[PDB]
Design a binder for these strands. Sequence first.
RNA 1: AUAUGGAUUCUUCACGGUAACGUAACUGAAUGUGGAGACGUCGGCGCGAGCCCUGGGAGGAGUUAUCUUUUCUUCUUAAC
Length: 135
Amino acid sequence: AKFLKAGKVAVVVRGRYAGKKVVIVKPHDEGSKSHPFGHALVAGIERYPLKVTKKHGAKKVAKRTKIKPFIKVVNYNHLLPTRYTLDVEAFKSVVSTETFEQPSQREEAKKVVKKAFEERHQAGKNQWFFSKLRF
RNA sequence: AUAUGGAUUCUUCACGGUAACGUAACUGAAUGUGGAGACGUCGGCGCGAGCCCUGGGAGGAGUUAUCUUUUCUUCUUAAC
């Protein structure tokens, strides 16, 4: 009866990432020392890949399929849950509370998430997650 | 017209904040959408500026038979 799990896909509602699709990695229902509210550790897409047709050459397809990821701590009230799901075991260990509050560890996690997202986009699956929302 | 510094880039086109949002910067053609330009009158209330009134002090002038620590006057600060 609870849907705020570690694989749920949500849509950000506020904070420079509004309208961007995201997947929950680690939820914290009963607050913490900081963020005294229900929140989740999420990883999403900041720059969606562009549409690719059969006319594009091999040089241009690679450029248009690049994905720019991000990691964020988000309040539950600022997320819009969906019915889709996405596996997080490939980058669950790198996105955590220790990853934040440290500039060096933030970028190391993001490049790990970037590799997982690009391989997911190849061999098309979770196509709704990689489709930019129009609003 | 143009150069340097800074910023940015090997994850190519910046990061922080749960968020409202912040910043010295931080690619955006056609086309589209929105905002500013752009707006009546009366009433009381809040606040600002100049003026008016006034205290102490530092100067100048006037009155002084008698009274008045007194009467008058200067003490200012632009765009950006």
